[PDB]
Point group: C8
Chain length 144, copies 8
């Protein structure tokens, strides 16, 4: 086990700034601070925000960025905002599914409400883009 | 104060400073934004009419505004206490109070509202929120 | 006066000054806006033909105009008193009086109007209002 | 002369002067607008071919034209007296006479006309008017 | 001198002069417009290839052409006397003769025609005309 | 005027003389720069006429296709129509012989006609008039 | 003869033999070999190879269709799909490389759909698609 | 090293030289393309971000890349040995291994995959391949 500044939802701008340096994206440090990107905004970043508001011109560079961010979201501490422990429920299906925790929690979802979620809600509201991931989370939510 | 519907332009000016958006004070006052207009601000108005170019800055602004909508005093315009009905489902649902009352809705009329009206008229964009408010309203 | 349908350009000019929109006086007289045109003003005419560029400023304008439409004298054109029928249902619904009477509608013909007609012909944009006016019309 | 269908370009020119639209006399004359073309004038033709840029000014024009169309002499072209049948439902409906007469319609053929035809062929844009004319035509 | 299908360029040139369209004489001869092309002229061909920019002027042009098509001699190409079948329904329906004959249609084939064919192939744009011609054809 | 009516076999020289016979000698040079032979002439589209051959006017194109349609009606298709689809089309309407090359270029013949669809007649064979498509379609099924 | 096996040199000689020596330089800068020639699309012809005229492209594909019809596919058509397609209609043998490039053969042909023949194998004519399919189903 | 998924930028640089695409080394290095990104390269990324404008050159590139993907070492990332399951149906199908493995798929989950998912998520564009993989996966 380890000690880590790991609670991404609680991150302020300084934590995001250090993280960009840690992943080799120090080129965008000034851009992330002028936009005042904190933990909550980082977890809700869209490609449009990355491209237009943060200036990440290359689609490959954006793929690299989101590849790093997805890695960190998978191993993030969500305890400050996940009272139902939605993270460990997603992890029980697949460790890779922990990345969706903040998306589900930001919509006010929890274990008790999962059985009524739809595919459109998982895509538009929670931002689960991969249909394979949506389908497995969906069928698991309805089988309870 | 917290009775946002009754806010005048001066209160909106004070609130923008408290949330770190003092750069946009002059533009909000040139547009004469009061409590009612602040509660009905759309992304297009923020971007074009108020000059908030960045979509991230707009996300920050609406994140602050959504917090205040959750803990606002709506007593001056909410005769049926729609706010505590929304809060009984989820505290975050109180933010939709002004949207629901501006359409003339109240507890007596809620069971007949549609998903389409909740999205186009009341401005509830998240489908999880629309669907939950919808099912709860019909169980009346 | 209070009879907005009967207003001439001079009354519209005085009304714009009284509501703090004297900035748009010259534009409203160039377009020769009288009472009938004011009550049928669309957002497109406001923006393009009258030069009200800001969507927030237009929202303020229609908020004032909605108030005066709610408390207007329609005696010269509302023989069936559709205004007080709409007002008895919901105070804000009285603003729609001129939209319905300009289409030749009245109490006797109201029950056969559709939601499409209320939106396209009479200009009732809020779907909640359209549904309530319609449902009440059928209960006659 | 009150028989608009029989109007020549000179009559249209005099009529524009009587309604305060003499500014557009020269445009109407180079476009050779006579009575028949005036009664079939569309908004797009007004805007592009006649140069009436403002939507409010176009609304005033059609407001005058609709008034004249309601109290017009159709004896030269209305073999079935469709005008007084339309007027018997609502005086406002005489304005549609030339639209129906231009399509070769008459009292005998009204019962088989559709709402799509009244809108696309005859140019009756208001759905409330279309619905009343249809229900009355099919019920005679 | 009314057998439009047989017209050469010289006949079209004089007709344009007779109807006050001498402005477009040279354009019609550079395009080598003869009787057959004139009877099949589209609005797009008028606007783009013949330079008739104004939509009102094109409406005026087609108003003259439609009048002439109504009183034309089609004997050289109408074996089935489709003109008098259309004329027995309505004198104005004779204008559609060349549209029906150019598609290889005749009385024997009419009962099998659809509305889409009358619109797209034969060029009967008015739905009231299409619907009457259609129902009469099926009652054979 | 002198010409083999077997249009499918035409070479570039035949197309050149044919363009002159119909008064389109202005477009001869463009037709030879594009190397239009009998097969290409019978498959010319409005797009090719406008862009590749430079016939800007839609009326001039209508005039051209009016000339071309007449020759297509009275052409010799014997070199490529083993099933004699031409006289089958002619039995419905003489003007329907114009569609012969369109039908044979798609590999159609009498034996396959009963299974052809409306979409195939429009997209593949190029029969644009719906009245013609509908009559040819119903007639093929009556076999 | 074995078009699938052609290298750039064979394509260069073929362009000269069909009178398209004007496009040798563009075909050589794009390094068109046999496999690319058999999969050439009109978009590639126009944009990447510079054949601006749609009529010239139609002429080119008319020559290419000729050679695809009479090509030796032995190096890549183990199921001899070519002579099966040609036996239905000579016009159909040109499609051989399109079907074998998708891993198709006689045994799997009956399982192909009309949409697949158009999108995957590139058989544009609907009349050809329908005939090849119904014959495959009667196999 | 044949294990393309574990490749670093240096391996991708060496691979581009071996396949004759050393022209694009500088662009692939400026974009920091490693093994994982190379196996997920799209047509748009090749064109816009890597500067391979010619569609034929891109077709050549993907022809080489598909070859290496078919005979690649997936032991570091293919826990279910999806590669040899795909290869047993058709050797060409090993090329899809990383597409399915990147979506968290394995042998146990294949029977529930849809054609839409194979195309949108895993990037299997040929419908014939999609149909064969599905039918075989469901026959388990």
């Amino acid at each position: 086990l380890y000690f880590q500044s790991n609670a991404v939802p609680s991150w302020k701008e300084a934590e995001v700034q250090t993280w960009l340096q840690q992943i080799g994206f120090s080129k965008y440090c000034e851009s992330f601070r002028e936009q005042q990107v904190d933990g909550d905004l980082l977890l809700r970043l869209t490609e449009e925000e990355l491209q237009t508001d943060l200036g990440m011109k290359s689609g490959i560079t954006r793929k690299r960025f989101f590849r790093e961010l997805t890695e960190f979201k998978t191993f993030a501490n969500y305890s400050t905002c996940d009272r139902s422990n939605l993270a460990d429920w997603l992890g029980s299906l697949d460790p890779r599914f922990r990345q969706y925790t903040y998306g589900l929690v930001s919509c006010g979802l929890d274990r008790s409400l999962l059985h009524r979620v739809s595919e459109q809600q998982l895509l538009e509201d929670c931002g689960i883009h991969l249909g394979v991931h949506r389908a497995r989370i969906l069928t698991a939510a309805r089988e309870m």
